[PDB]
Amino acid sequence: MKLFAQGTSLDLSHPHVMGILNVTNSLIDAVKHANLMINAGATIIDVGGESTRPGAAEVSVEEELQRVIPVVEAIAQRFEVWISVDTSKPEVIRESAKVGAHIINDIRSLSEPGALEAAAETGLPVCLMHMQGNPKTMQEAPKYDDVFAEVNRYFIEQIARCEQAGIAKEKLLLDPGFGFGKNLSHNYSLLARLAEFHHFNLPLLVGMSRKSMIGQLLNVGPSERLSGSLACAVIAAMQGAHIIRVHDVKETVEAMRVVEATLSAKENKRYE
Amino acid sequence: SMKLFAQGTSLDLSHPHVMGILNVNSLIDAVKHANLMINAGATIIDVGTRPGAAEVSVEEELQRVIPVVEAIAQRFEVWISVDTSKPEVIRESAKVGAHIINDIRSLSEPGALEAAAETGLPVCLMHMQPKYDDVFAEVNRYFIEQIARCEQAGIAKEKLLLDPGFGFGKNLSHNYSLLARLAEFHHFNLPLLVGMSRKSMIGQLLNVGPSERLSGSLACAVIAAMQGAHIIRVHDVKETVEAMRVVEATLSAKENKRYE
Ligand SMILES: COc1ccc(C(=O)CSc2nc3c(=O)[nH]c(N)nc3[nH]2)cc1
Ligand SMILES: COc1ccc(C(=O)CSc2nc3c(=O)[nH]c(N)nc3[nH]2)cc1
Description:
The structure is a homodimer.
Chain A lengths: L1 E4 L2 E4 L4 E7 L3 H14 L4 E5 L12 H18 L3 E5 L3 H9 L4 E4 L8 H8 L3 E4 L17 H18 L7 E4 L8 H9 L12 E3 L4 H7 L7 H13 L4 E4 L2 H17 L7
Parallel strand pairs in A: 3-4, 3-10, 4-5, 5-6, 6-7, 7-8, 9-10
Antiparallel strand pairs in A: 1-2
Helix pairs in contact in A: 1-2, 2-3, 3-4, 6-7, 8-9
Bound molecules: ligand YH5 (2 copies).
The site of one ligand YH5 has 17 residues of chain B, from strand 7.
C-alpha cells in the first residue's frame, strides 16, 4: 500500500507518525516546530490554519491563505517530509498543492462548494474524515443508533462521491474522526472496531492525541494526556492503522517502533 | 470471571491490574514508595534481586523482605507479590500477609515447591533459561510441565499464574515473538502476568538508556493488555494505569473483549 504525490511516494507497509503544526514571528516558529518534529521521526507534517474545535468561528479565505501557504512553502523547500494541509477551502487546496503539499486532509471531506473539484484538479491524495454535523454544533448532542455502521456507510457514500468526481480510489484515505460529533462511548466503539474499516482496502488515518476521549476518561486537562494518547496510538496501530496524527512526535514514534517489532513477529501482521 | 483468593481477600481479574515494583529507615522509605504506587493506582506491589545480582543468605533475605511485606500488609489493602526462590522466605512471607509467590526460578530450589504448596497462596510460574526453534512452543511446553509439577504437589490449577518471562535468556526477536503471540497462552485458562517495563527489549530496539524507556514500556503494556493480559508489572505506575484505563474503555466497547 502506497501513496504518490509531488513526484515522491509514501510507503504505508508500516505506521507513519504525522506531526500536528497548528498555525491558528509565526513563520519562523512554525518552521522550527516542523524541524523538531521531523528530527523526532515524523514523516508527515499536518498544517492547519482554521480551528476545527467545538464552537470554532470561521476564518476568511485571505487569512487562511496567509497562515497556511507560507508555512507549506517553507517546509516543502527545506525538508523532504510529506505535508498535509488541513483545509476545507478550494483556494487553499489549489494554492497548497502549487507550493508542494502532498495530502488534502479536510475535516469536511470536501463538502464546501468547489472543494471536490479543487481536490480532483490537484491530483493529490485526499483524506475523507467522518464528522456528524459541523464544528459549531457537532458536540452539542452527538447521537447514533449504531456509530460504526453509520460511519461505515458515510465512507461508502463519500468514496463514491470522490470517484464520481474523478478522484481514483487509490488516492483516498479514511479517518473515523475521533471527537467530531461523538461522545466518549461513540469514540471507544470506533477505536475498538477500527480494524473492521480495512474492508475498503484504503489507508486509515486516526487522530486521538490529547483529545476528549482521553480527557473525559481520565478527568485531566490537555497537558496530562500523553500516556492516554500513546495508548490510543498503539491500539490503533496494532489494528493496522497507517497514519497516526499526534502532538507528541518523539514518544509516539518510539511507541510505533515497538508496534512494528511486534507486528513483524506476527504471522498475519494485524490485531482484530 | 477469573479471580484469585489470598489472605481473606480477592483479586478480580476481569480487567487488567497494574503491579508496581518495590526495590528493597529502609522500611520507612519502602512504605512511602508503596503508598505512592497505591495512590497512582497499583493494586499489587511486587517486593524483592534481578538476574546478575548478588545472591544472599536465607537470613539476609528474611531480614530484608519479611519486615517490608509485614509493614505493607499492616497498612494497606493492596495485594503483595513476593519475588523469592527460597522455601523459608516463601513460608515466612505467607505468615506475614503476602498474596502471591512470584518465583523467577518457578520453585526449582529444594523445598520451594513444597513450601509454596503449604502456603495455599497463588503461585506465578515464569519461564527462564538465546536459541530456540519456536520460542512460543518451548515456553508453552515449559508451562505444561510446570503446571503438572505443581498439580502433583497439591497446588490446584486455580492458584496458578503464567508469565512468559520477557528479557530472561531471550534475545530481541524472541521477546517480540512471545509478545506478538501472547494471546495464544489463554488456552490454559490461567491468569497471564507480564513484565516488560524498561527492559532491554525496548532499550535495544530504540537505542535509549534505562531512564528513557517509558514510551516503549507503555507500548508493551498496552500491546499485552489488549491481548487479555491480567497483571502488568511496571516501574511507572501512574502512566501505566492511565494507559490501562484506555485499554479497558476499548475492550469494554469490544464484543470479543480481546485482540488476537
Ligand atoms: C484538546 O483537545 C483536542 C481537540 C482537538 C484536537 C485536534 O487536533 C483536532 S484537529 C483534527 N483532528 C483530526 C482527526 O482526528 N483527523 C484528521 N484527519 N484531521 C484532524 N484534525 C487536539 C486536541
Ligand atoms: C534495564 O534492564 C532491566 C532488566 C531487568 C529488569 C527487571 O525488573 C527484571 S526482574 C523481573 N522481571 C520479571 C518478570 O518479567 N516477571 C516476574 N514475574 N518477575 C520478574 N522479575 C528491569 C530492567
